[PDB]
């Protein structure tokens, strides 16, 4: 092992991303979540149940990102600085996961939280998604790991992220929304960086191997997409919001593809997002 030297950067992007991610450090304690309690009370039982089921699902997936996802990328690092950035990314996945417990602690009743956790264990789409992603992380193909990671958090998570953005547009749970925006800001950069490194890795494989991987990426995408539509149906069952969530998924799927250097797949008509949701993002 050789001493890392941050004054001998091989790829400028490593330093750029190191600096962006570390200077954006946050903890859920920094968000005044207790100011959401009155808003939480005004939500219907069905909305409350939805919120807890959404966040227990995200907890599983952020735990996967912390324990297996980010570490699985470390042996495939091109530079020592990338390895260091991946250490940050992994730790921030633990922060993301922890933050959902922060929401539960502040706003929710233990028994209901535990029921939402139980519902998540039993939900077939959620578990299939975790299984598919984990399978690629445990595989022997470094490039497929990067594809899976970008798909999970620049695309799949947005079935969950839709909800706090919706509440934000209605002026409800604005603090939980601010918390989620911090996570989304991290994940935008994670997806960018991992997708960037994906494209760097691809430069060193044959043209034929690239076309093969392109086909795989769109296959995996559509498999995960089909699964996420079902997850969305079951999550948003007692609301009229499913179609809107699905449009938001297509919009995010397109960005995840762009992170990897591929052109958007879903046409404007499938990816037309409620302007108030977009405004909630920015």
């Amino acid at each position: 092992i050789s001493a890392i030297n941050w004054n001998k950067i091989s790829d400028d992007k490593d330093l750029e991303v190191w600096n962006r991610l570390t200077s954006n450090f946050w903890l859920p304690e920094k968000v005044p979540l207790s100011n959401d309690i009155p808003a939480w009370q005004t939500l219907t039982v069905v909305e409350q149940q939805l919120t807890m089921r959404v966040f227990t699902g995200l907890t599983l997936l952020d735990t996967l990102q912390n324990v297996i996802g980010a570490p699985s990328l470390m042996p495939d690092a091109l530079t020592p600085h990338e390895e260091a950035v991946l250490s940050n990314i992994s730790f921030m996945e633990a922060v993301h996961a922890r933050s959902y417990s922060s929401i539960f602690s502040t706003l929710c009743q233990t028994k209901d939280v535990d029921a939402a956790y139980a519902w998540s264990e039993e939900n077939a789409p959620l578990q299939r998604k975790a299984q598919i992603i984990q399978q690629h992380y445990r595989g022997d193909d470094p490039l497929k790991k990067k594809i899976a990671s970008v798909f999970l958090e620049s695309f799949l998570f947005y079935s969950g992220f839709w909800l706090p953005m919706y509440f934000s547009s209605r002026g409800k749970l604005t603090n939980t929304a601010d918390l989620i925006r911090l996570i989304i800001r991290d994940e935008a950069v994670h997806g960018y960086y991992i997708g960037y490194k994906y494209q760097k890795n691809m430069e060193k494989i044959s043209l034929g191997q690239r076309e093969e991987l392109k086909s795989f990426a769109f296959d995996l995408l559509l498999e995960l997409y089909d699964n996420e539509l079902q997850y969305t149906d079951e999550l948003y069952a007692e609301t009229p919001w499913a179609d809107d969530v699905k449009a938001f998924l297509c919009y995010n799927a397109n960005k995840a593809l762009m992170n990897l250097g591929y052109e958007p797949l879903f046409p404007a008509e499938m990816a037309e997002v409620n302007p108030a949701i977009l405004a909630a993002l920015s």
Binding site: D12, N19, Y196, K255, E263, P264, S282
Partner: protein, 128 residues
């Protein structure tokens, strides 16, 4: 005409390639510089802030504080990511105010077909 910058990640480059309109790239290599001879719109990504804090890349600053180049600027399009919130497309905003030119459009990453279509239409109508 169009002037643009794209970092080593090439998102803005891919937008330009798919736009299909003639355009000149501000060199990635900071020591190289370019000049333009006719009026242009500038397309720039936002980068607040991986160690510089500024949303405008250094290469674009060096391009803009050449008097000849600055005088021919007429409008700015910004790329970035909505997930940056209030900072989405911030580079266009900074340039818009500092130079006193309109901030014309906002798009994400390499741009959708809608973005390509919108910019194509916007650019033609602007110069007329």
């Amino acid at each position: 005409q169009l002037v643009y910058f794209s970092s080593s990640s090439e998102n803005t480059q891919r937008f330009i390639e798919r736009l299909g309109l003639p355009a000149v790239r501000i060199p990635l290599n900071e020591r190289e510089r370019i000049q333009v001879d006719e009026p242009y719109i500038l397309i720039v990504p936002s980068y607040g802030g991986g160690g510089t804090a500024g949303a405008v890349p250094r290469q674009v600053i060096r391009f803009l504080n050449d008097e000849h180049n600055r005088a021919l600027l007429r409008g700015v399009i910004a790329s970035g990511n909505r997930n940056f919130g209030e900072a989405y497309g911030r580079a266009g905003d900074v340039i818009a105010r500092k130079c006193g030119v309109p901030w014309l459009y906002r798009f994400e990453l390499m741009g959708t077909q809608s973005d390509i279509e919108n910019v194509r239409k916007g650019v033609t109508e602007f110069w007329q």
